[PDB]
């Protein structure tokens, strides 16, 4: 029966070990191997939703407050986040808040940057001011992509984006992707600055509520997407 | 229209009639959906007896050598074992062999029939390697052909010689799956086997 | 009797031209007809069948039957082969006929 | 034959009408004009669910009114959600709902209206409130919206639900920028939310009490 | 002699252990392998029947009693199983009988369900009456696809089945499957409940039975199907 | 062991058994090997799959014969084509980080 | 160069042990492998004859004596095998021999026996009567193909065929293929039984051999054939 026959392969660059694979897997490629069990297929059915999808980004893209402690609060108490919009600022030169920086912000971006580390896209931020329809007021927003260590009216320099209260709410300022490079590091490496900044004063009548504030949630898109994964992690958490 | 026991036609069953009504479950209306991919054999036969396991067995003193032949009754069988009645089938066998590390071979073969002396290596061979997988498929043939008794149990034989020896223990596994089953099968399915007499 | 079902539909659709729902008529109503129907059918049909096999020079006349009851498509046979000692058939039609020993010795 | 339950009877007479019977089906004429309705269509509308509560004892992480889940309509003690239900044992259905929250003007406050859909409520665990805000909700400002509008396609594992056990979505209200206070004004706003039901299945029936 | 040559293969993903399997076998798909011995193969003649079949379903399908002391008895001694229809029970709301429920029934359902382990389709239930041409009588038949503990004249309510008997029997009572997700449990896990109840009475002349009786008998289908193997067992049996 | 001995194992579904497990399924993994295996879904009860149970299911894992030393194992997954949609999304924010 | 490339097979089914068989060889499927040795090959001829010839069967068919002691004898002293017909054992219903039975025999269907196990055909017979011109005679042959003990006339019943002596022998009676199944074991499991008798005396002259006698040799075919190998044996021989 010798034809021959196959004789041969024999390549084998190998080894049969991995082959298959163990190492484990990369990327994919590898479907369901040593099939297998068997056998058919299966049939499955919503509802559920008709939401067959990819992306990922699609489930980034949901505005999402920053933390419980960011300032810190939440309770811790009161505030309340977002610090009080309350008259004795004045002075238009002022505010608070602050950064440092970062992608902490624990809204699930916490979990992205604990999975993969490296991306390009910018952090979309909204204030959200309450107040009722009586009172008024204005107000800015520094932000810095590089960024510094406070770091005054330069925050009149950079970007900026007024503030007016209202009818009615909310608000936003963007920023553009912004670092040498292409991707960058996903951990503590850098990001900028962020101040809201009082101008002039948000008033009160003599019935009204005196005291008025803020919240502030980010999100990433719509440019964005992320490369590479990583084991990270927080423990785990 | 309600049937009546030993009354007309013969063993089939019906549509069991489009009652009851609707109404809305409540009696029909029952359209079958495939829900698998759809290999759906799950039900039919051939696939289940397609796959395998079976006993777990014939352990192996080491002293000597020879056999001794063992009797496959095929079932056993006696894990899956729950389905059956019938007669036939042209196997397909799988052999493990855990003995001396890479030491030794293991000669098998079968069968038919009654004895021998003899030369086993005649009727066939299958030299299987230590540690190595549990491979063969056996295809019929005197054999006589009439099928087979159903219960004999099952008819048969297999044989296995661990040729040299390495001065150490020896063990070895036998699975099987018959495939292709022509089984039909057979007059089903008498051999009611209810027993669960278990 | 006959009519009588029609007419528990002829109701049934007396009430259907409510689409509620849908409807068929409660309960399921939609059958008050029954199956062709009440009548007769088949078991005591009787005569309802009365049989009268045959088989050579006997003959078996049986005035209540139940029904054949043949398990699974027989399809039965007429070798085979396969074959089964060839030897076909024989006599008798044929075995009585042939030749045979008959004599002695002086 | 009628739903649910044959009647295979053995020796009939006749069916037996009186005088040409040719029965409806109004009428009409009219007999009080409401068609027709449910159940079909009574069993779904509107509904009360709520209660009241409020002023600034709540940090606003502090939760509020939960609603509760399919059984809420069953233990009702008004619509569907009692007589028929009370029958069946299995529903599978929508769910459509208005909330309502009315202030005195001068005020502002965020109400928070989430509806977690049977997340093994866990222990919701402390820090994943954003978290809590990923889910199909909507967010009140109080100070102008004096209403807000739901709607809740329902998704559960199984394919269906048992009535008053097995439940699946629950209605949260949380707090949000615990609310504000000018002297002075009253000191409660409290809540309402009011249900309604799409096209609503009841199937496989079982005893009266259960 | 060196193309190249074949130089490679080379994948392998693998560890050449299975490959070959062992493992085992699933699904099939792993047809005669390493072949094989040789070579030819049979030509099969009937009879037999000209009844090569798949399923499965087919072999249920055969109505079959529910075991032997289902209530039990047979004999056990008489009943003589299905209990007795026999006066003194009159009292148009009762009669005896009983599930809880099951699956068990053991007419071969058993080995299915020690064998498979998922399904969906119905349990078409026989009830059988034997009595004599003269006397008559009517009664009904609870079944609640659930189900519950006992559980009284809600059968009124839950599905029915009317019973004349009569000219001649025997009877039948289907359920549709009823159950949520899709496969079922074929273990202890649920189904459903059932009652025989008298209406009115099984009357008797003075020449007659005076006793008068039932046999009742279940087959699955014909709708349905079963999934996935399993161990089991039942010892063996 | 030192190519000594076998390894069979198979899932799962579902609660209990007695049992000869060969019939659910097998997959000799013969000593120091490489660790291969899909398995499709069904009965299974489709549903899907609670999603935090977890997870619902199993793995029968046994060691055959023994070669009188000790022994280890090593179980990895990957989940490929994931049909999950996902269903709704992104619910069980699960920002724990309370880690 | 990874195109890819190759990756990848990895079935392997396997366990790379046979794979390259042992095992061993069945059905031969296994042509000349890890070729080879090397290379072309060869160009033989004749003579020899033109015969290149599977089959087997075709050696077979051959007309071969019933080994050496049948009877036995040969020589063993005379007879001379075949007994003798000689007068004295007239009374036309007697005669002498016998099979029980069988497959041996020895003329080289033993080796086939003893290395084949299975079949399917005839073992057409030839009884030859040596006399001399002058004297004739006539002489039955019985055999019947199941078979029992010795058994009597019913000789007279089954299969028959006259011999007249003559000019000139020898003669001829088949058997066709009678039995259950197909195949029949050809181990000393089951054949029939055969006697020659005396109907007519075998007379003589006053110059003449006033004895005659016979041999009797069989062979298989032309249907025959047989099925599946064996290792048997003989010891071996």
Same mark, same amino acid.
């Given at each position: ?41 299966? @049939? ?9 999808? @990819? ?49 902490? &912000? ?132 | ?198 | ?106 | ?120 409520? @866990? ?75 799409? &096209? ?11």
């Amino acid at each position: 029966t010798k034809y021959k026959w196959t004789r041969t392969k024999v390549d084998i660059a190998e080894g049969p070990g991995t082959m298959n694979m163990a190492n484990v897997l990369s990327t994919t490629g590898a479907q369901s191997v040593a099939l297998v069990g068997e056998r058919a297929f299966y @049939d499955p059915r919503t509802a559920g939703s008709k939401s067959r999808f @990819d992306d990922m980004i699609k489930i980034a893209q949901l505005f999402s407050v920053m933390s419980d402690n960011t300032t810190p609060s939440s309770s811790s108490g009161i505030d309340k986040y977002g610090y009080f919009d309350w008259a004795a600022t004045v002075a238009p030169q002022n505010m608070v808040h602050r950064n440092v920086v970062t992608l902490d &912000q624990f809204p699930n971006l916490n979990l992205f940057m604990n999975t993969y580390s490296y991306f390009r896209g910018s952090l979309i931020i909204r204030l959200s001011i309450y107040a009722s329809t009586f009172n008024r007021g204005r107000l800015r927003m520094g932000f810095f992509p590089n960024c510094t260590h406070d770091t005054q009216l330069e925050l009149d320099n950079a970007i900026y984006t007024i503030c007016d209260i209202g009818s009615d709410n909310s608000f936003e300022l963007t920023i553009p992707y912004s670092f040498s490079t292409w991707m960058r590091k996903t951990h503590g490496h850098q990001l900028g600055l962020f101040q809201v900044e009082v101008l002039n004063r948000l008033t009160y009548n003599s019935s009204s509520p005196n005291k008025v504030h803020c919240i502030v949630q980010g999100r990433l898109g719509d440019d964005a997407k992320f490369f590479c994964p990583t084991g990270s992690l927080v423990s785990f958490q | 229209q309600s049937i009546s026991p030993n009354e007309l036609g013969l063993t089939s069953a019906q549509d069991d009639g489009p009652l009851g009504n609707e109404k809305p479950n409540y009696f029909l209306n029952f359209r079958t959906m495939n829900v698998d991919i759809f290999t759906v054999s799950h039900t039919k036969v051939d696939n289940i007896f397609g796959r395998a396991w079976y006993v777990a067995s014939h352990d192996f003193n080491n002293g000597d050598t020879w056999r001794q032949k063992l009797t496959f009754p095929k079932e056993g069988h006696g894990m899956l074992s729950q389905f059956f009645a019938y007669f036939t089938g042209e196997i397909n066998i799988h052999i493990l062999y855990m003995a001396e590390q890479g030491f030794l071979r293991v000669a098998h073969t079968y069968d038919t029939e009654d004895n021998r002396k003899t030369f086993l290596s005649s009727n066939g061979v299958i030299t299987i390697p230590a540690g190595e997988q549990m491979t063969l498929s056996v295809p019929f043939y005197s054999n006589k052909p009439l099928r087979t008794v159903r219960h004999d149990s099952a008819l048969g034989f297999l044989m296995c010689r661990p040729m040299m020896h390495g001065t150490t223990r020896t063990t070895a596994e036998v699975y099987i799956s018959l495939r292709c089953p022509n089984f039909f099968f057979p007059v089903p399915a008498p051999k009611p086997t209810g027993s669960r007499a278990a | 009797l006959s009519n009588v079902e029609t007419e528990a539909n002829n109701i049934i659709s007396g009430n259907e031209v409510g689409g509620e729902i849908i409807t068929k008529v409660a309960d399921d109503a939609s059958n008050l007809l029954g199956p062709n129907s009440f009548a007769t059918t088949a078991q005591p049909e009787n005569k309802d069948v009365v049989q009268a096999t045959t088989t050579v020079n006997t003959t078996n006349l049986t005035q209540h039957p139940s029904a054949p009851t043949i398990p699974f498509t027989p399809d039965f046979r007429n070798v085979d082969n396969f074959h089964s000692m060839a030897y076909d058939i024989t006599t008798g039609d044929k075995n009585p006929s042939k030749l045979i020993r008959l004599d002695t010795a002086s | 034959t009628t739903v649910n339950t044959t009647n295979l009877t053995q020796h009939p007479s006749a069916p037996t009408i009186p005088f040409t019977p040719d029965f409806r089906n109004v009428d009409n004429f009219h007999s009080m004009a409401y068609d027709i309705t449910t159940g079909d269509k009574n069993p779904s509308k509107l509904i009360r669910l709520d209660t009241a509560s409020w002023q600034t004892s709540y940090s606003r992480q502090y939760k509020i009114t939960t609603v509760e889940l399919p059984k809420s309509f069953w233990d009702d003690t008004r619509k569907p959600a009692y007589g028929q239900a009370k029958y069946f044992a299995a529903v599978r259905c929508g769910f459509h709902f208005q909330v309502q929250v009315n202030v005195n003007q001068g005020t502002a406050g965020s109400a928070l209206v989430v509806y977690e859909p049977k997340p093994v409520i @866990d222990s919701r665990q402390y820090l994943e409130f954003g978290s809590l805000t990923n889910l199909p909700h909507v967010l009140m400002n109080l100070a102008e919206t004096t209403q807000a509008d739901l709607c809740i396609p329902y998704v559960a594992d199984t394919n269906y639900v048992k009535t008053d056990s097995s439940d699946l979505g629950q209605l949260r209200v949380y707090v949000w920028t615990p609310l504000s206070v000018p002297t002075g004004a009253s000191n409660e706003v409290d809540v309402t939310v009011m249900g309604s039901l799409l &096209q609503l299945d009841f199937q496989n029936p079982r005893p009266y009490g259960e």
